[PDB]
Design an enzyme around this catalytic site. Structure first.
Site, PDB file in Angstrom:
ATOM      1  CG  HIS A  46      -0.158   0.033   2.500  1.00 30.81           C
ATOM      2  ND1 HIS A  46       0.470  -1.088   3.001  1.00 30.81           N
ATOM      3  CD2 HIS A  46       0.126   1.040   3.356  1.00 30.81           C
ATOM      4  CE1 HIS A  46       1.111  -0.771   4.110  1.00 30.81           C
ATOM      5  NE2 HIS A  46       0.918   0.514   4.347  1.00 30.81           N
ATOM      6  CB  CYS A  95       2.289   4.342   3.932  1.00 36.67           C
ATOM      7  SG  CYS A  95       1.938   3.691   5.671  1.00 36.67           S
TER       8      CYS A  95
END
Ligand SMILES: NC(=O)C1=CN([C@@H]2O[C@H](COP(=O)(O)OP(=O)(O)OC[C@H]3O[C@@H](n4cnc5c(N)ncnc54)[C@H](O)[C@@H]3O)[C@@H](O)[C@H]2O)C=CC1
Ligand SMILES: NC(=O)C1=CN([C@@H]2O[C@H](COP(=O)(O)OP(=O)(O)OC[C@H]3O[C@@H](n4cnc5c(N)ncnc54)[C@H](O)[C@@H]3O)[C@@H](O)[C@H]2O)C=CC1
Ligand SMILES: O=CNC1CCCCC1
Ligand SMILES: O=CNC1CCCCC1
Ligand SMILES: [Zn+2]
Ligand SMILES: [Zn+2]
Ligand SMILES: [Zn+2]
Ligand SMILES: [Zn+2]
Lengths: 376, 373
Positions: free
Chosen positions: B64, B175
């Site tokens: 991600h 992230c």
């Protein structure tokens, strides 16, 4: 009762834990430098005083308990000029020496005067010079939280009292000594309740009720009052609560009822009960994203909160005497009351003679009172 | 609307590593964008998914944290076109809900599981997957699924960034960096001249140090049980370094003594019961603020007295950034050299060597390993 001389007067002494207070005749020494001797006019019994008589809790004995009161200055020690005989005053456990880093900060109302940071209840058990002003039966008696109001006369540090309006009703403003101020300020200063917001208050004793008054003054559009004692609801509603919930009568955890009732939780929760149940519920019932929980009461040493909850936006903080810079704020609260900003009378359920202090204690332990005004 | 055949890393079940497989990535539907992943890193959250003790869905295309370019957009999509550089992320901003409109949070109504976000956004908006492998539908991971040459994300999970962005470094904004950086700036709200304490010096803690520095902290104490992490912590602004393993006293007492009372802001980017406890203990009384960033345990025990005496506790989610609106700005700041992401990349490996990047991370030998194609 003349200045410079030792005073003999009635006082309630706790010779040891788990025992009822004894009405004794004690000797109250005159105030030393930076101290003020006060004639206590009215005093209430705060659960923290009772807590001290709990065997399960740490405490010092013998001791003159009590810390919520109002009185008149009888005499001041050497070097004292901000106080003089005749002034009406209100002492408090939260000092404001005004001469330290903590006192200068607009972010806290703590003061470098405080020493113990793990057991505030056993701190300020003696004066600055580590001695006591109290003597009874040739024995030295401990002070309590820098106040010890369960004596017609007590001596406190200048940092632990404020001079208030000359026309203040000492039999009502004494509530500003701890209970009212703590709850009122917890909502206004610590939780920082905002206009139109939703609030939840757990525990509807003097503190919780004052927290409600505070949320109302702060502009909360909804105030949910929670208490396992249904009797506390009428007074709660009379002070601004829009919803009342009794965990004892709900099939689901009270926090889930609050969450559903508000479609996500409240913006601000204030735990004025302090049990494992309320502490957890107070955090759970707040909205994720920006939910704020303020710890006011604390019967337990710890609270456990999921990591995911804080990660998803819930915040936790706590109050100490409602976040008020004591010396500066207390006089203002007295003026607000004079101007009828709030009604302290609704917080008084009983008024007994000082001698009946033990009955005042029972009434509270039994949850049959909010505050009992004791007079000498 | 062509179906793309590419390679991707699939986690078939817990207890087993990722497998490089040839998958079929369906075209983007409405409010969706098919991204060509150019650079992706392994985050500890990706590793946790295969840990039996952790809740997760299988089979799944993990990952991600990445950066890429638009391969093709879905029907009605106008904010994106093939060739645009983009950065997806787990924190959505659909701009179609109540939470997005709120200035008090960066959460988004698109999220549904608030107890286990790692298993949320496991499928697209219409509850269907865009991944297929050997006649089997595969779950998406946290609205991103970057461990694939190509992936499809909801428009609420990506943002177009500077055309001259080095996708080989800006992927960290997906992230790790954004979370640590924003944790200091947005969540802890570090103030100029303040004193901070950062626990855990991985990509998140390091970015938190960068955040503290940018916010103007005058002192930044870096704590880690891995002394090998200090050199980079200092390179990024850390003024003091402490290794709990080399202190005879609990690290929080050392911090308290070294600062004569504690720090103004602590940021836990490690997340163990011990750091979480130390993170709170080491803050000053009166206004000490502890911000939870990393979390290896589900709960944290806070003494009632601490909170009463002025300490506060909060936590961050993607550094508190309104993802879609903020991500493009973080890229610009890097372009302008407001901070240097290059220091956060310690290794580089071909995508197929993803399991080697994972091993490096577990050995504590890396900050971030960029996976390229
Ligand atoms: N943080 C600070 O600065 C201060 C804290 N306090 C503390 O705040 C607390 C409240 O003080 P008071 O109003 O004077 O005490 P109180 O005894 O009158 O109030 C307690 C109330 O909470 C309710 N309660 C008990 N368990 C409950 C549960 N599980 N769920 C819901 N309600 C529950 C009781 O029925 C009662 O009405 C005390 O613990 C006291 O020591 C008092 C002053 C200052
Ligand atoms: N709140 C949010 O939105 C986000 C949270 N995270 C989380 O933040 C954490 C950190 O992420 P990374 O830097 O990428 O991970 P990492 O594994 O590289 O970082 C952990 C670091 O903490 C250190 N550490 C472990 N135990 C320690 C202890 N007792 N005392 C001091 N240091 C200790 C390790 O040596 C290591 O350097 C993870 O738990 C991750 O899942 C990541 C992104 C966003
Ligand atoms: O009730 C008065 N005081 C106490 C309440 C619990 C925390 C410290 C102060
Ligand atoms: O590491 C990346 N993300 C984390 C953010 C905090 C929730 C778990 C996932
Ligand atoms: Zn009290
Ligand atoms: Zn002070
Ligand atoms: Zn991550
Ligand atoms: Zn949204």
């Amino acid at each position: 009762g003349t200045q410079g001389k030792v005073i003999k007067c009635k006082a309630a002494i706790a010779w040891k834990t788990g025992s009822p207070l004894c009405i004794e005749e004690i000797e109250v020494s005159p105030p030393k430098a930076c101290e003020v001797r006060i004639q206590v006019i009215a005093t209430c019994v705060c659960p923290t005083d009772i807590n001290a008589t709990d065997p399960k809790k740490k405490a010092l004995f013998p001791v003159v308990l009590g810390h919520e009161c109002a009185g008149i200055v009888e005499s001041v020690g050497p070097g004292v000029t901000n106080f003089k005989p005749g002034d009406k005053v209100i002492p408090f456990f939260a000092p404001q020496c005004k001469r330290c880093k903590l006192c200068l900060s607009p972010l806290t109302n703590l003061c470098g005067k405080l020493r113990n940071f793990k057991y505030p209840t056993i701190d300020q058990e003696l004066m600055e010079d580590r001695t006591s002003r109290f003597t009874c039966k040739g024995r030295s008696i401990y002070h309590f939280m820098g106040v010890s109001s369960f004596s017609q006369y007590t001596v406190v540090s200048e940092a632990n009292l404020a001079r208030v309006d000359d026309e203040a009703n000492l039999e009502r403003v004494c509530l500003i000594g701890c209970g009212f101020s703590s709850g009122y300020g917890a909502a206004i200063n610590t939780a920082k309740v905002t206009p139109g917001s939703t609030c939840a208050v757990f525990g509807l004793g003097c503190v919780g009720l004052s927290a409600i008054i505070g949320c109302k003054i702060a502009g909360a559009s909804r105030i949910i009052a929670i208490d396992i004692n249904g009797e506390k609801f009428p007074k709660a509603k009379a002070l601004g609560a829009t919803d009342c919930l009794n965990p004892r009568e709900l099939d689901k955890p009270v926090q889930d009822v609050i969450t559903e009732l508000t479609a996500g939780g409240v913006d601000y929760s204030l735990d004025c009960a302090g049990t494992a149940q309320t502490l957890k519920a107070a955090v759970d019932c707040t909205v994720l994203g920006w939910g704020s929980c303020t710890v006011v009461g604390a019967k337990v040493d710890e609270m456990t909160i999921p990591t995911v909850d804080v990660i998803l936006g819930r915040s936790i903080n706590g109050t100490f005497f409602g976040g008020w810079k004591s010396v500066d704020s207390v006089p203002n609260l007295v003026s607000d009351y004079k101007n009828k900003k709030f009604d302290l009378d609704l917080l008084v359920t009983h008024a007994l003679p000082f001698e009946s202090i033990n009955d005042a204690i029972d009434l509270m332990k039994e949850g049959k009172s909010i505050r009992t005004i004791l007079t000498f």
